[PDB]
Amino acid sequence: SMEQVAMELRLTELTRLLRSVLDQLQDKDPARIFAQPVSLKEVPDYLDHIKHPMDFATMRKRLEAQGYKNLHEFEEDFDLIIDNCMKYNARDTVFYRAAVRLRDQGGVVLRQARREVDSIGLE
Numbered sequence: 001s002m003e004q005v006a007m008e009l010r011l012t013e014l015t016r017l018l019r020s021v022l023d024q025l026q027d028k029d030p031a032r033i034f035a036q037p038v039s040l041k042e043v044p045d046y047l048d049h050i051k052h053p054m055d056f057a058t059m060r061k062r063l064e065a066q067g068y069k070n071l072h073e074f075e076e077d078f079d080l081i082i083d084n085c086m087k088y089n090a091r092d093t094v095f096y097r098a099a100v101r102l103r104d105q106g107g108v109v110l111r112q113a114r115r116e117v118d119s120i121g122l123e
């Protein structure tokens with residue numbers, strides 16, 4: 001139907017915006033601490049601690065499959081990256097501190113993304 005196509009165009013548009021958001025968020029992780037899934041070889045007990053692992057590579061895969069239906073879903077995954085890290089790692093670690101900085105710097109980007117999605121009406 002034309003309606004299905006129209007909705008698919010909207011999703012494709014949302015995906016374009018979220019790709020820009022994702023790039024901006026990942027730029028705030030220049031150490032690439034969150035670039036890839038935590039290695040279960042390097043950290044064999046990780047899944048005993050963290051029940052829903054997340055990372056930028058995994059988000060990017062879901063994104064390119066047009067797997068985010070709205071900004072909320074995307075934000076959920078971003079928050080998993082930060083929240084998982086701040087639980088597994090102690091306060092005095094480079095990992096925890098990187099998560100705090102990513103959360104803080106990233107709030108700015110996500111604040112504008114919310115306004116843009118609403119105004120352009122992408123969801």
Ligand SMILES: O=C1Cc2cc(O)ccc2N1
Pocket residue numbers: 038042043085088089095
């Ligand atoms: O959250 C993490 C993931 C990781 C990998 C590693 O080799 C050492 C520490 C930590 N903390």
